[PDB]
Amino acid sequence: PVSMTKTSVDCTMYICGDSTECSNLLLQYGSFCTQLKRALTGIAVEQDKNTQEVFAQVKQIYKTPPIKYFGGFNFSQILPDPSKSKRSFIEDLLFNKVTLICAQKFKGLTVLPPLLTDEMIAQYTSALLAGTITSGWTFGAGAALQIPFAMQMAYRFNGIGVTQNVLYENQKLIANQFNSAIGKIQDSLSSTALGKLQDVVNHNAQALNTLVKQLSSKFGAISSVLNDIFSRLDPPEAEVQIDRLITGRLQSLQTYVTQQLIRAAEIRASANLAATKMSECVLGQSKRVDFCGKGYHLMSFPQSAPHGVVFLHV
């Protein structure tokens, strides 16, 4: 996972709705609401930076040659097509695998869209993939230095300590094994794995739904409805029963913003890990054990995903 759903709340709408008296008492609470807005705006800006650090690791957008023959290796399941949101087939499977908002909009909890849309993240993915296929690790260090892909795979074999003749005697076997492995990856996606991204989406939907359910709570006041207790109580006493309601709803909003800050720190750590894997494994070979797959890591491909990135570790 890379990003999280950017949510922002309007206090005047969540704790009071359209009551004027409640808003004046909410104003008495004062800087309590400004602090909860700053935290959510910092979370949203942090989730936009986390997407920019993971996917925008390349300065120039690279394009694949119009004829696609790279050493006999098939990349058509991972390269984007011009028929479609220009995404690849394995990216289409990943976006199809991961899947009430009007009620949250009517309670002041709105969801900001990300700064980079999925077509732009897919273009970043296609640029890093085209640089990886056509240039190897040389586009990460500087300008893109072309290279045949068989000789690039010989450089990776010398990186893992295998002599170059093993690939050049078995290039058809290595290409067929790579194509069969990419077909297994397709079958493992379409037939049946993306638990982290669905867990992130389900956790944000469950926290938002818990914040919607916190309005149905009297918090010990006679009634949850702000207007009802204004009519069923004397005006000095009603202030005590709304103050008890604004205190409880502000405690629920603090709980939501605190858990969202902890979840945003976890997603920020995972996005720093994903950006580290995108530099070390996609833009170079890694001698780090099990940091880029179980095996002598050869190479990696990035593939966009709903609020996340999927690395194909060869």
Ligand X SMILES: *[C@@H]1O[C@H](CO)[C@@H](O)[C@H](O)[C@H]1NC(C)=O
Residue 311 β-bridge partners: 302
Q: Contacts with another protein in 198-227 (CB under 8 A)? A: 209, 212-213, 215-216, 224-225, 227
Residue 80 interacting with another protein (CB under 8 A):
no
Binding test (CB under 8 A) with another protein, winner from 94, 200, 207, 283: 283
Site for ligand X in 231-290 (CB under 6 A): none
Q: Which is nearer to ligand X, 67 or 102 (CB)?
A: 67
Number of residues that bind another protein (CB under 8 A): 111
130 binds, options another protein, ligand X, none, Cβ within 5 to 8 A by partner type: another protein
Q: Which stretch binds ligand X (CB under 6 A): 68-76, 90-98, 104-112, 187-195?
A: 68-76
Q: Which of residues 76-95 bind ligand X (CB under 6 A)?
A: 76
Least distance CB 52 / ligand X (angstroms): 28
Which residues in the chain are followed by a discontinuity, with C-to-N distance exceeding 2.5 angstroms? 84, 99, 192
**What does the block give as tokens for 27?**
């104003």
* Nearer to ligand X (CB atom), residue 74 or residue 272: 74
The minimum distance between CB 26 and another protein, in angstroms, equals: 10
DSSP secondary structure string, 70-120?
BTTB--TTTS--S------HHHHHHHHH---HHHHHTTTEEEPPPSS-HHH
Query: Binding to ligand X by residue 69, rule CB under 6 A?
Result: yes
Residue 76 interface partner, choices ligand X, another protein, none, CB cut-off 5-8 Å depending on type:
ligand X
Contacting range for ligand X; rule: CB under 6 A; set: 5-13, 69-77, 79-87, 128-136:
69-77
Long-range contacts of 151-157 (CB under 8 A, 24+ apart): 153/71, 153/298, 153/299, 156/285, 156/298, 156/299, 157/298
Distance CA 33, CA 92 (A): 41
Task: Scan residues 122-181 and list those touching another protein (CB under 8 A).
Answer: 123-124, 127, 130-131, 133-135, 137-151, 154-155, 158, 163-165, 168-169, 171
Q: Does 67 bind ligand X (CB under 6 A)?
A: yes
Q: What 3-state class would DSSP assign to 245? A: helix
SS3 289: coil
Amino acid letter for position 246: I
Cα–Cα distance list, 253 to 190, 260, 289, 296 (Å): 39, 10, 43, 48
Of residues 86 through 105, those in contact with another protein by CB under 8 A are 100, 103, 105
Q: What is the DSSP letter of 221?
A: S
Query: To the nearest whole angstrom, how small is the minimum distance from the Cβ of residue 288 to another protein?
Result: 8
The first and second tokens of residue 155, run together, are 């450089």
Residues that bind ligand X (CB under 6 A): 67, 69, 74, 76
